[PDB]
């Protein structure tokens, strides 16, 4: 059942790598840092770099196809290259961007994709944008990613860039997010053994957490049916044990229940 039995206020691991001096400028916000136990560790870095294994990102495992997520911050100018090393290494084929690049005059994510019909190299990674599709609530970008110089490493990465999240609050109706999530679901399932779905917003905790928790709950309903046991606080705590603070506001909390209730109504 998607009923709210408990209030948001009742919801309330080391982060050593993200606190290192060499990593300070890789964080958008000084005290929003990844837990060491779940962080994405980047291998095959430039051997001239003393620290090349860090990005502010955690794998989120729900605890049926086994689907996982990478929850991360919007790219900074100096972390675009590392963001593409992460997507490549993890075999991610779907990216979910939940913000504009700039909202109310503050940067939330540096543009990390090329324009439509262009290619750019971001460090050792080559990214080609072969087609955009602009739908009411989102734009889908079909990106081809390969390692520079390297034969047959190309794979398609589908970036779903949600466009209709308000600058204040949350959407007043979840229909846009549910249609977007259903297309992400079908895309991910269409690609054999795809890696984690990457999800980001400015800090990688509030909108990112709201999206990931809704998706996890809907996937439970896929497996178990509309009358299954749902426990939204328990799920939020389970995601919070893997990245600090996921789901930031009471409106986001209410929006989770509304989204799942609406999904159930659809069936």
Curated annotation (Swiss-Prot):
Domain description: The SH2 domains repress phosphatase activity. Binding of these domains to phosphotyrosine-containing proteins relieves this auto-inhibition, possibly by inducing a conformational change in the enzyme.
Processing and modification events after translation: Phosphorylated upon activation of the receptor-type kinase FLT3. Phosphorylated upon activation of the receptor-type kinase PDGFRA. Phosphorylated by activated PDGFRB.
Impact after mutating residue 58 to S: In NS1; some patients also manifest giant cell lesions of bone and soft tissue
Result, substituting residue 210 to M: In LPRD1; does not affect subcellular location; decreases protein tyrosine phosphatase activity against CDC73
Active-site residues, record numbering mapped to chain: 201 (phosphocysteine intermediate)
Consequence of changing residue 233 to S: In NS1; increased phosphatase activity
Gene source species: Homo sapiens
Record protein name field: Tyrosine-protein phosphatase non-receptor type 11
């Amino acid at each position: 059942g998607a009923h709210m039995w408990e209030e948001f206020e009742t919801l309330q691991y080391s982060r050593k790598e993200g606190q290192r001096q060499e990593n300070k400028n890789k964080n958008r916000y000084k005290n929003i840092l990844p837990f060491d136990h779940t962080r994405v560790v980047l291998h095959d870095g430039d051997p001239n770099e003393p620290v090349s294994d860090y990005i502010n990102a955690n794998i989120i495992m729900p605890e049926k196809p086994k689907k996982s997520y990478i929850a991360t911050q919007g790219c900074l100018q100096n972390t675009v290259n590392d963001f593409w090393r992460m997507v490549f290494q993890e075999n991610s084929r779907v990216i979910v961007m939940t913000t504009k690049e700039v909202e109310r005059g503050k940067s939330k994510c540096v543009k990390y994709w090329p324009d439509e019909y262009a290619l750019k190299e971001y460090g050792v990674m080559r990214v080609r944008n072969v087609k955009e599709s602009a739908a009411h609530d989102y734009t889908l970008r079909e990106l081809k990613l390969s390692k520079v110089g390297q034969g047959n490493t190309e794979r398609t990465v589908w970036q779903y860039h949600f466009r209709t999240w308000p600058d204040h609050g949350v959407p007043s109706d979840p229909g846009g997010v549910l249609d977007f999530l259903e297309e992400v679901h079908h895309k991910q399932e269409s690609i054999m053994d795809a890696g984690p779905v990457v999800v980001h917003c400015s800090a990688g905790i509030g909108r990112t957490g709201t999206f990931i928790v809704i998706d996890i709950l809907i996937d439970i309903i896929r497996e178990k049916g509309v009358d299954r046991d749902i426990d939204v606080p328990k799920t939020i705590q389970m995601v919070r044990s893997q990245r600090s603070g996921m789901v930031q506001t009471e409106a986001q909390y209410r929006f989770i229940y509304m989204a799942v209730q609406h999904y159930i109504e659809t069936l």
